[PDB]
Structure formats: structure tokens, C-alpha cells
């Protein structure tokens, strides 16, 4: 009759002692009642192994800030040549058009709310680079809630690659960020002596205080979160919003998003490009042997993905038993930042040869030398992730080879999904119409929206 606590199974209620029976074995038991008549007979040798004792609110908020101007932006047309010098490359005229388009959306007193899309690998950073430079040109802070902390690290590397001649105080807050640096950055932008922040949603869950809520540029909201989309809405009180989410939500918001988000896609985003020479098969290890021979011939890098449902280092040893030539390394999650950044700088070193990830969030890096990608688990993947793997490898002046494997050759949803993947030819808007079909399946209302549009002007 005690509120005992088993160290393994939590709650327990003391009932007495039992001299119960085993197969001819006389060991004794102390007995515990659990939740719903769980009568565990623990042997007495465990004597020290026991202890004693809704959304329409947010909808009308969204329609309010849609109806609300908020703030205006001056152009400042002299600062941007200075940092515009800092990238020695040409700008696509479609991209330059979308740049000036979203910047005139910034300069209006209405909230800037756009989405530039296009087939990836073209410097979607650069429009955000010069927009953020104009925003810090007026002293306003720049935030970047990122999909992956790896992409946060790479984006901070690119930002510091641009912010050499600027006194811009950049920072990255994540789980991977060390805690002294975490609360030091929380302090530094809480009083605003840190200018531009990147990171995952510790930025959104540790209740940080901001200093200028002007520009919010978020990418890849498709895997951010639905209630975390509402968390974005909590962050987005009277702000100007940019989404570089070329991969959208499956029309559960993107149906209504058309119309009030002026879709600002660009075509032929990069010139000098190559069609991704994809293939598809079931699994075969000799094909992997020939493929890694191909990539060591061209001297390139290899991504390799997995399901993470088990350990991946045993699979890695199996591939090394297949190929004892290259140097294969796993970038599995649930490791400290030391391990992850050591793997990142070793693949920057490149003595390690095959990046064995398990997630696009584990592998959303624009590594240049990669031109070979192989997937075992393409059956259990959403289409957006799949083409994000496809475009996530890809560099100038180089072909690319993709090897996606079907274990059953039979799952009809994934069969037609991989079919409408494999219809690809090259870059340019095929992802957009593919997303359109996926969003047709995504919905598969305007009436309440006509109601809320009416009352939002009254509010």
C-alpha cells in the first residue's frame, strides 16, 4: 500500500511479498499493482532497484495584417552598389526582374509578401542578399528561420562571404549552437547589437526578444510545420514577408495563397546548365560499384541516403565491404555539433568521399563536386523531398547521375509518384507543374474566405 516508483516502469503500488513459483525455482517476489491491474512480481534481488515517493483567431489576424500596411521602406539607392560589387557574377534578367519586383513590394507601405520560385540552383540567396542589405541599410534587423541547421551554417558562411566589407553582426542559434553562444546571441540581438540571425526554431521556441521586426525571409515552409506555420504567424505580427519556398504546402494553404501572394517565379534560373541524367532501377550492388567507379573517374562527390530506421554505420561497413576503395562517412543525426561539423569540414577536405546521410535535412547542401546520387528508400518519400534531392545535387559544367531504387516495384502510389518524377527532362518549371498536380492531390475554403474577407475590412 505504497506509492512506489519502479525505476524502469514508473508508477507502482505496493501489495506485499510473494514466494511464488518458477520452473522448479524458489525465488521470492515483492509485488506491485500498476495502472489497470498490472501485477508485476519483481524478484527480491531487485531490492535496491525500486524507490518510494481556435484557428479563426489566427485567420482574422492574417486578414488583418493583410489589410494593414504596417511600415514603408526607403530605397537607399547608393548602398546597394557597394555590396552588389561583392558577388563577382552576372544576374539573370528574370531574377533581376523578380528582385526589383519584390523590392518595390518592400518600398510600398503595404507589407512585402511575395514568393519567387523557379528550378533550383540559381542563387535564390542573391535577391535575399540585396533585400537584406537594404533592410540593414535602414538599420532594420534580418532574421532567417531555416529548415536545417546545416543550411543555417552554410547560409552563415555565405553571408560572411558577403559581409566582409559590411559591419553586419551575424549569428546562428540552433540546438547545434553551444549554450554560452546561444544565450550570448540571445543577449546580443535582444538589445540588437547582433544584426542578422539564422537558425532553427529555438529562435521560435525560446522566447527571444527582437529589436526590428521588419523583414522575415523563410525558405522551405513545406517541412517547417503546420502549427509551426501558426508559430510563424505569431512571429509575423506587422512584418514584411519573403518566402523562398519553391516547394510549397500541398494546397492546404497554397490554394488560398495564390491571389494574395504575387507568385514571382523565374525561368531558366541559371544559364550554362545541364539536364540531370537520371536513371531508375531496383537495387543492385554492382551498379553501385560501377557508379562509384564513375565518380572516382570524374573525381566528384557522392551523396547516399538511407531510411535511418536502423543504424547506418553497419550498412556503411557493408558498402565498404563492397567498395574498399573510397572513404565513406555517415552524417547521421542525434550527434553533437562537433561530430557534424567535423564531417562537414572533412568533406570540405574531401578525403572522406561518400556522404552517407539519411535525410534531405541531413543533406540539403549545395556541395559543388557532387554529381552522383543514389537512393534506396525512394518508395517512402514525399515528391517534394525527392526532387529536392534531385536538384540538391547539381553544379555548372557537369552532368549528374541519379539512381533511385524500387524494392517492391509495386506500391502504386509511389509507382505513379516515381512515374511523374521520371517524366523529367531538365530545368525549367517542370517542378512547378509537378507541384500543381501534387497540390491537386493535396486538397483531394473559398466560401468562408469570402466571409472573412468581408469582415476584415470592418475590423
Amino acid at each position: 500500500g505504497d506509492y512506489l516508483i519502479h525505476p524502469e516502469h514508473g508508477v507502482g503500488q505496493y501489495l506485499g511479498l510473494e514466494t511464488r513459483e518458477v520452473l522448479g525455482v524458489k525465488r521470492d517476489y515483492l509485488v506491485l499493482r500498476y495502472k489497470g491491474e498490472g501485477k508485476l512480481y519483481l524478484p527480491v534481488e531487485q531490492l535496491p532497484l525500486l524507490k518510494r515517493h481556435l484557428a479563426g483567431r489566427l485567420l482574422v489576424l492574417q486578414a488583418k495584417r493583410k489589410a494593414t500596411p504596417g511600415r514603408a521602406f526607403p530605397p537607399l539607392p547608393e548602398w546597394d552598389p557597394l555590396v552588389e560589387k561583392g558577388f563577382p557574377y552576372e544576374l539573370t534578367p528574370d531574377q533581376k526582374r523578380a528582385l526589383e519586383e519584390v523590392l518595390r513590394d518592400l518600398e510600398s507601405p503595404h507589407p512585402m509578401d511575395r514568393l519567387v520560385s523557379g528550378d533550383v540552383g540559381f542563387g535564390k540567396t542573391e535577391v535575399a542578399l540585396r533585400a537584406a542589405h537594404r533592410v540593414v541599410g535602414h538599420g532594420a534587423q534580418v532574421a532567417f528561420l531555416v529548415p536545417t541547421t546545416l543550411l543555417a551554417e552554410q547560409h552563415g558562411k555565405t553571408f560572411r562571404e558577403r559581409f566582409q566589407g559590411l559591419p553586419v553582426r551575424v549569428a546562428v542559434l540552433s540546438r547545434f549552437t553551444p549554450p554560452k553562444e546561444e544565450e550570448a546571441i540571445l543577449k546580443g540581438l535582444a538589445e540588437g547589437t547582433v544584426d542578422i540571425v539564422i537558425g532553427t526554431h529555438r529562435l521560435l521556441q525560446e522566447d527571444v526578444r527582437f529589436r526590428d521586426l521588419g523583414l522575415l525571409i523563410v525558405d522551405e515552409e513545406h517541412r517547417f510545420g503546420v502549427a509551426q506555420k501558426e508559430r510563424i504567424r505569431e512571429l509575423k505580427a506587422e512584418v514584411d514577408t519573403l518566402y523562398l519556398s519553391a516547394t510549397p504546402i500541398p494546397r492546404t494553404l497554397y490554394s488560398a495563397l495564390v491571389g494574395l501572394k504575387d507568385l514571382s517565379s523565374i525561368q531558366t534560373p541559371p544559364p550554362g546548365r545541364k539536364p540531370i541524367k537520371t536513371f531508375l532501377a531496383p537495387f543492385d550492388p554492382l551498379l553501385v560499384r560501377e557508379a562509384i567507379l564513375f565518380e572516382l573517374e570524374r573525381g566528384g562527390k557522392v551523396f547516399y541516403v538511407h531510411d535511418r530506421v536502423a543504424s547506418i554505420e553497419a550498412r556503411r561497413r557493408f558498402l565498404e565491404s563492397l567498395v574498399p576503395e573510397a572513404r565513406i562517412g555517415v552524417v547521421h543525426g542525434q550527434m553533437p555539433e562537433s561530430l557534424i561539423e567535423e564531417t562537414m569540414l572533412l568533406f570540405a577536405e574531401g578525403a572522406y568521399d561518400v556522404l552517407l546521410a539519411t535525410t534531405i535535412i541531413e543533406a540539403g547542401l549545395d556541395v559543388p563536386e557532387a554529381n552522383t546520387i543514389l537512393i534506396e528508400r525512394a518508395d517512402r518519400l514525399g515528391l517534394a523531398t525527392l526532387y529536392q534531392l534531385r536538384g540538391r545535387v547539381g553544379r555548372r559544367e557537369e552532368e549528374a547521375y541519379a539512381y533511385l531504387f524500387h524494392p517492391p516495384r509495386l506500391t502504386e502510389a509511389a509507382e505513379k509518384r516515381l512515374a511523374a518524377i521520371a517524366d523529367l527532362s531538365d530545368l525549367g518549371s517542370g517542378h512547378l507543374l509537378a507541384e500543381r498536380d501534387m497540390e491537386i492531390r493535396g486538397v483531394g475554403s473559398l466560401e468562408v474566405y469570402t466571409e472573412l474577407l468581408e469582415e476584415a475590412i470592418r475590423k
Binding site: 518458477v22 520452473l23 525465488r27 498490472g38 501485477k39 508485476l40 512480481y41 519483481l42 524478484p43
Partner: protein, 48 residues
């Protein structure tokens, strides 16, 4: 009583194992509202 021989762990429970159709008073069965019955089956006896 899930009983491991070695560690003596006796996880005792009262599990639920589905439903068993009950005979009516007169001897029928009520399956999905339909009135059904079971007929005996003769066969060869076992043995030698």
C-alpha cells in the same frame, strides 16, 4: 503471465481476446441481425 525464466520478471495481465458469439435460448445465432444456425458434420472416426 509473461514469465522470463532467468530474471524472474512476471508481467501478469488480463488481456482482451476479441468476442465469441453466444447461442440464443432456443439454440440459434444472431449474426449481423441475420438468424443463422450450425449443422452437425458427420465423418469417419479416428483410430485404427
Amino acid at each position: 503471465q509473461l514469465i522470463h525464466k532467468d530474471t524472474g520478471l512476471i508481467k501478469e495481465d488480463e488481456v482482451f481476446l476479441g468476442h465469441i458469439p453466444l447461442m440464443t435460448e432456443d439454440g440459434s445465432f444472431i449474426i449481423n441481425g441475420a438468424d443463422r444456425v450450425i449443422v452437425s458434420q458427420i465423418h469417419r472416426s479416428p483410430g485404427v
